[PDB]
Amino acid sequence: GPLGSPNSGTKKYDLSKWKYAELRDTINTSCDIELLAACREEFHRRLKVYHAWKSKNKKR
């Protein structure tokens, strides 16, 4: 089609690891279905593992 794009070597978003500062700042400064959607995914995810570490919560 029109768009040839004879050079592909990157993705759309990538947040291997972000800081708590930029996290809150970017969410309160930037705005985008992706930025926010990704921000929440990291918040919930990062928090999910946080609890898992401390206590995996398990009562046999």
Residues 37, 53: Cα–Cα separation, whole Å:
24
Longest CA–CA span in the chain (Å) reads 61
Residues 35, 15: Cα–Cα separation, whole Å:
10
The conformational region for residue 45 under phi > 0 = left, psi -120 to 50 = alpha, else beta, is: alpha
**Under 8 Å CB-to-CB from 39, ≥6 apart: which residues?**
23, 26, 27
User: Is the separation of the CB atoms in 38 and 13 below 8 Å?
Assistant: yes
Ordered by start, the domain boundaries in the chain are 9-60
Burial class (CB in 10 A: 0-12, 13-18, 19+), 48: exposed
Determination technique for this entry: NMR
Q: What is the DSSP string of 7-58?
A: -----S---S---HHHHHHHHHH---HHHHHHHHHHHHHHHHHHHHHH----
